[PDB]
A paper describes a structure:
The l,d-transpeptidase LdtMt2, which is responsible for the formation of 3 → 3 cross-links in the cell wall peptidoglycan, has been identified as essential for M. tuberculosis virulence. The extramembrane section of LdtMt2 consists of three domains, two of which have an immunoglobulin-related fold, and the catalytic domain which has an ErfK/YbiS/YhnG fold. The LdtMt2 active site within the catalytic domain is bordered by a flexible loop (residues 300–323), sometimes referred to as the active site “lid”, which creates two entrances to the active site: the inner and outer cavities. The Ldt mechanism is proposed to be analogous to that proposed for the PBPs, although employing a catalytic triad analogous to that observed in some cysteine-proteases, involving Cys354, His336 and Ser337, for the formation of the cross-link between the donor and acceptor stem substrates.
Residue numbers in the entry: 59 to 407
The structure:
Amino acid sequence: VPKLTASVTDGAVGVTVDAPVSVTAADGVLAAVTMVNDNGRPVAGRLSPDGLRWSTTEQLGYNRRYTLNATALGLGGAATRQLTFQTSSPAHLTMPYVMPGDGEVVGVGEPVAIRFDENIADRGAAEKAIKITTNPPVEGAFYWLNNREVRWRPEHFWKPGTAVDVAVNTYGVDLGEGMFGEDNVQTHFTIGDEVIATADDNTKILTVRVNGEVVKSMPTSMGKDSTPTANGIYIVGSRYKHIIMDSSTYGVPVNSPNGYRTDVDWATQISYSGVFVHSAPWSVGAQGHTNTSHGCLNVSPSNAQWFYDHVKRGDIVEVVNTVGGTLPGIDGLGDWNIPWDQWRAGNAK
Ligand code: NA
């Protein structure tokens, strides 16, 4: 007599939709399989050529009730089952967003970033749902900067030519306190040339190195003693032909002593706290000699444009020997300032 198996049991509740629903016939073949929702709408599925396995072919829905009818035939006899089950009903939904973009070529400092639009009560579940693939394979780990964003990077800077695949399979996954993922995301990026630029407060020079060779030496003016540029490793972020810098976006009023509202050209972002490489005609004389800025690396127009043209997202800017501290690891572009052993251990709780 044919036997029927299913990936769900009749009367089940909280069936997660991260996996498809299957039905298997033993000692026989599947003659008919149908699955409809509470409204009577049929679900897409495909039967295997051998007739032994049937699986849904489209993702299932939240807060739904599904009814499954299966018939199995064989030389001996026939068997029919009806199964109804309710999927999980999330309390809230959160959509993930992944950087860098699909197909992008990025520098050796670009981490993998998964940002959610809600606080994540169960970080371990989120890390479990994210699969990272590297070629050549290299060790990495997760670390959380705030409650909504997590990062993945190796111990050392990426090796150029490394392929990276990010599968955020959070759909159907309970991320804590009834917070389920809105969808799945799949992005892929590649590591380009090694580009490391160093800013030494002693020489007041920003040197750009491509694959270990000096290609540009830029005299610069960094943060003055009152508002210094922090030392450490910076990841290059967004680039702007021109951008109005407003201190108020960082909580500093414009009318305050340290506030400002200045329009600059050829601005490359290297920290979330507002540190940029940008064109500063007004300080070309100070550049290479004294620090006079709020934190940004002031350089000449031609050098700023050159930086814009030859530096890509993920490249590195390291600052040393300034009177400031060290760029916070939680900044958003300061991932590499966290010691490896701390990063490796993670903060999943
Ligand atoms: Na329902």
